[PDB]
Structure 1
Amino acid sequence: TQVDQILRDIRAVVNQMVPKEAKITEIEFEGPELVIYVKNPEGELIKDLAKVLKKRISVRPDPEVLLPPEEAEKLIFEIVPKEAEITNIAFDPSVGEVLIEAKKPGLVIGKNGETLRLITQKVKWAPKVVRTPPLQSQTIYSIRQILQTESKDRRKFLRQVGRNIYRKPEYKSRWIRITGLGGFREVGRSALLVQTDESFVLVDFGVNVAMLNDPYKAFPHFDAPEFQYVLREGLLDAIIITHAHLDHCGMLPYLFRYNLFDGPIYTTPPTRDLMVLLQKDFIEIQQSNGQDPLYRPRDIKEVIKHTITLDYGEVRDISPDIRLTLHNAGHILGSAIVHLHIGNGLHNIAITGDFKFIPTRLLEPANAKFPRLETLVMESTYGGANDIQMPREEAEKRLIEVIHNTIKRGGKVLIPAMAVGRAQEVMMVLEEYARIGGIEVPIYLDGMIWEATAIHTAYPEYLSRRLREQIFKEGYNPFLSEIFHPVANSRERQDIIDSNEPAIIIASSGMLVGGPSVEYFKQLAPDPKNSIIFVSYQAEGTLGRQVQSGIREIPMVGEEGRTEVIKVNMEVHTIDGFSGHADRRELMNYVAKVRPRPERIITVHGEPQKCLDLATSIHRKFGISTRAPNNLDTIRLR
């Protein structure tokens, strides 16, 4: 590592373009950027010295000239209008920045950007105002508490990452290869290893909850020689998470449990929070089932401490020959398409993760415009030629149809859905339907769906333009609808089931693998008055896919090794018009619209035949080279 020889040349030109009166106390790399500390604020020299050094710079005051938290926290409630209504105020010393939250962020941000600098001087801390979210999230609060109490660790973490990213100047890769450790010709445990002769980055690291009883099918291949080498030698530069779902980020905290990695995890803020929530959710579902969890809160916590967030469009160097950029995937809040600029730029890779290419209630179609692009890795969940989804609006009509029939017949509607994803989407469908007077019976929300929902309201900028304004700007907010009733605990859950009142029940998780939805299913499945509606992809080996297949008698190993058979009499429906996955038509259209036209396309994340079908179809229609690799396949990209 010749990092300090690089830092030496920087400290030379910086101490040549910076006011020597401006007592520079330090210059070092912290995360994906150069930071210059100075005890003397003050502009437009950053814009320069930055484009001169060809690096991302950030000037700040020495952490010493910063008024303590418990102190400057009262000086602020003094220097800002009481009408500004400051709901919360947090600190993040790892960046010397004060996060100020208020219902009326205008009177706190300075009626002329003034009060912003007004308080900035009185405490030296970097102010950042945030409009109070309409719903408070335990997850968000928890992450905030961790970031201000772990300041010591993170500041050290950011120095290590920085010295690592710039272990050498911009390098042109000699070779590039991608290895599927999981998620090739199957849905589950997505894990792809990007390799160059200088770097190693992991894109996604999921688990296959549908196959939890089989460690050989549930986890990415830890037995891959190249991967054991990368971990054991400490060569993994980074991990990039496309989105919050467990089959894309679920094994991430396992890596910390066993101290196999302590580098950076790059992802969008919404993803960092949703991920943390689904991971906590996961290990709790396991314990509530009497199983030993894959990891513990202490590991999920380590994940948070090792995560560096980027918003879409932010280009960042994550190693000597790899620059990252995230783009909207339109799958779920915060979902991204990973774009890796590698070496010379003549062999760039775009990794789709899961994506949607038409608008939905919460999101806009995936980005299809990139700078330079040679290889496109895309999902195939609906890759079969006949995998056309039901039109958005016909699905809505079908849903309403079914709810009416069931609610009349004196029954209940069970809609299994993941905490994040279809839950929110379906909620919007029922909410807009409520506003015209269609919701008579109550709508219960079980399985952390409400907490996830809270996270959405805190990231309006990651929602579609339509819903963005409708949220933060207006006082009215769709999720806040009085039609949704969060299930408080196991007693109420049981009350709900025993009660004779018809109702709509939306509960995690989406494939009946675990969580409240399995309880509802089991106790409601016998009565033919009830209805269960699948609105998401049912993976192979899930109870959900069994029910969906029509199997009317399902065995379930219960407590004390005794198996129990649930008799299925309730109505089984499938409405795929709410899917977060691009359907066959969308996938093919995506390839058509993507620009620049990729020289190669690799199909993944889909049942075997679907991956091949899509790959064959893309080649036949667009004449582009394609391939549906197997796990453990490695493709050299030249």
Structure 2
Amino acid sequence: PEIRVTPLGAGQDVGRSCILVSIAGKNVMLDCGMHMGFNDDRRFPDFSYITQNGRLTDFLDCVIISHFHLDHCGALPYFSEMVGYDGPIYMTHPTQAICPILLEDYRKIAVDKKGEANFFTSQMIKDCMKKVVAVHLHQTVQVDDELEIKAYYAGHVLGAAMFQIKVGSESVVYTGDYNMTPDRHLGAAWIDKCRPNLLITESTYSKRCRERDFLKKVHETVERGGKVLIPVFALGRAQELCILLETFWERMNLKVPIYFSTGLTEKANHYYKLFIPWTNQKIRKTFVQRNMFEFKHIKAFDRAFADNPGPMVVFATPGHAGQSLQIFRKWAGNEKNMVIMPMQVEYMSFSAHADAKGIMQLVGQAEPESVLLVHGEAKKMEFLKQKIEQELRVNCYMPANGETVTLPTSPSIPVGISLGLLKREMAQGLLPRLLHGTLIMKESNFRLVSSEQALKEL
């Protein structure tokens, strides 16, 4: 009658999301990500806690991947095809499209350039994706005879999902990454009144004004004849910038071009085009008029039209690295050299995750009886734990990496009630009337009938 949770990954840190939940005798891992910034073989989570030279298929009944960010999904090919796991890997449909191409990109980064000796190949990336079972929104999939999981729209990236892990009467809701404010291409996070036993949520932390200022800067720089070189590093930020730009260019109706580069942002554009139901309300509603991800102004950059003169908008492949530094050096000391990091330099930052008030709202609206914090900074987690334990009067927890946290729960016994006794109790008392009956505690089932039904069926 206990729920034991052990984050082997993030804990009181950012990156390498990996949380183990042992609810009601069934063990579920909640993400499997890699820690960027480490190169000393601490990228992948320490799976020696679960098994030391043992089979992970027996130990783990389910593996959940929240979204395609590498700190939540980057360690998946290693965990499957090197340590050994041939069980169900549950994942969202847009996540299952983006995850191979971001894993291959980091495989291209780590194997070619920056120190990967113990790593995964492309063949075992495909092998790991072959074990992935895709789930839809709000679909209750039965991994076991009694363990079921259900995905909720998280709105962090395309196909980011909040997972509720329910077995018996006990449920655990894990929210990998989410944002309670809608973006220009994504909706907001939504959860019903589940009232789970535990809410494992991220804890790491205006928008219209910032977007208007960025658009005004871009418009003022492009109306002066200069060219902007705004870079993008994440796929969600790139798609949001492209859709916000495209609706601005269509609204102002000026025809000077906007371009995006690389062979990966094009793949992201195609996958975002193929996953319209996982987008914002405007993109779904105005899809019948036109596909908003089929850009009529943002076109493919053949070296940014061979870096031709004139005012134009260019998207750089990284956020440094190649395919951006050549543009940065070729446009330094120009008329309008506006480069906006997340030789005029502007600073326009777009938040992809939720802030403190969004986490407060999610805890209030899901209404759990306990909250657990991962995926953030320790000081911010302490402040948010104080806010949780003060404003909503509900227990909060501070687990580090490898630090187990156990929670006592009170299961409710499912008992059948004979319909005659139930209708009799509906009859008298509706006008604190007691219900006196006999509990026939048979094998593997429970019946609670009247004394007459007890004696006639004794």
Q: Distance in 2 between matches of 1:630 and 1:274?
A: 30
Are residues 1:190 and 2:14 paired? Answer: no
Deviation at 1:182, TM superposition (A): 1.3
Alignment of 1:287-366 (within 5 A): 287=111, 289=113, 291-292=115-116, 294-342=119-167, 344-345=168-169, 347-366=170-189
Q: Distance in 2 between matches of 1:400 and 1:501?
A: 19
Deviation at 1:523, TM superposition (A): 6.3
Q: Distance in 2 between matches of 1:519 and 1:302?
A: 37
Contact 2:204 2:380 in 1 (8 A): yes
1:485 and 1:227, CA in 2 relative to 1: closer, same or farther beyond 3 A? farther
Are residues 1:590 and 2:356 paired? Answer: no
Alignment of 1:49-198 (within 5 A): 174-196=1-23, 198=25
Contact 1:285 1:515 in 2 (8 A): no
Q: Which letter maps to 2:271?
A: I
Aligned to 1:205: 32
Question: What do residues 16-67 of structure 1 show as CA deviations (whole Å, max 9, x unaligned)?
Answer: xxxxxxxxxxxxxxxxxxxxxxxxxxxxxxxxxxxxxxxxxxxxxxxxxxxx
Gaps of 5+ in 2: 409-458
Question: What do residues 282-338 of structure 1 show as CA deviations (whole Å, max 9, x unaligned)?
Answer: 212335537548322112211221011110111122235521000100111111001
Contact 2:28 2:62 in 1 (8 A): yes
1:334 and 1:625, CA in 2 relative to 1: closer, same or farther beyond 3 A? same
Contact 2:227 2:313 in 1 (8 A): no
Question: What do residues 569-606 of structure 1 show as CA deviations (whole Å, max 9, x unaligned)?
Answer: 54141333xx22122222222223x23x2111112111
Contact 1:406 1:413 in 2 (8 A): no
1:609 and 1:532, CA in 2 relative to 1: closer, same or farther beyond 3 A? farther
Aligned to 1:272: 96
Q: Distance in 2 between matches of 1:528 and 1:195?
A: 60
Q: Distance in 1 between matches of 2:322 and 2:200?
A: 32
Deviation at 1:432, TM superposition (A): 1.0
Q: Which letter maps to 1:245?
A: H
Are residues 1:575 and 2:382 paired? Answer: no
Q: Which letter maps to 1:194?
A: V
Q: Distance in 1 between matches of 2:268 and 2:127?
A: 21
Contact 1:328 1:367 in 2 (8 A): yes
1:229 and 1:186, CA in 2 relative to 1: closer, same or farther beyond 3 A? same
1:299 and 1:570, CA in 2 relative to 1: closer, same or farther beyond 3 A? farther
Contact 1:445 1:484 in 2 (8 A): yes
Deviation at 1:404, TM superposition (A): 3.3
Which residue of 240, 261, 264 corresponds with 1:446? 261
Higher relative contact order structure (alpha carbons within 8 Å, sequence separation ≥ 6): 2
Q: Distance in 1 between matches of 2:13 and 2:163?
A: 20
Q: Which letter maps to 1:533?
A: I
Contact 2:12 2:400 in 1 (8 A): yes
Length, aligned pairs only: 405
Aligned to 2:295: 481
TM-score (norm 2): 0.80
TM-score (norm 1): 0.59
Q: Which letter maps to 1:247?
A: D
Aligned to 1:457: 273
Aligned to 2:337: 530
Q: Distance in 1 between matches of 2:22 and 2:325?
A: 41
Q: Which letter maps to 1:314?
A: Q
Aligned to 1:540: none
Deviation at 1:231, TM superposition (A): 4.8
Aligned to 2:249: 434
SS at 1:319 equivalent: coil
Contact 1:445 1:485 in 2 (8 A): yes
Aligned to 2:407: 637
Q: Distance in 1 between matches of 2:27 and 2:294?
A: 44
State the percentage of identical aligned residues. 28
Deviation at 1:502, TM superposition (A): 4.1
1:402 and 1:215, CA in 2 relative to 1: closer, same or farther beyond 3 A? farther
Q: Distance in 2 between matches of 1:229 and 1:201?
A: 19
Deviates more, 1:286-295 or 1:187-196: 286-295
1:424 and 1:354, CA in 2 relative to 1: closer, same or farther beyond 3 A? same
1:305 and 1:315, CA in 2 relative to 1: closer, same or farther beyond 3 A? same
What is the RMSD of the two structures over their aligned residues, measured on CA atoms? 2.7
Q: Distance in 1 between matches of 2:333 and 2:5?
A: 48
SS at 1:298 equivalent: helix
Deviation at 1:357, TM superposition (A): 0.8
1:378 and 1:634, CA in 2 relative to 1: closer, same or farther beyond 3 A? same
Contact 2:81 2:128 in 1 (8 A): no
Contact 2:229 2:316 in 1 (8 A): no
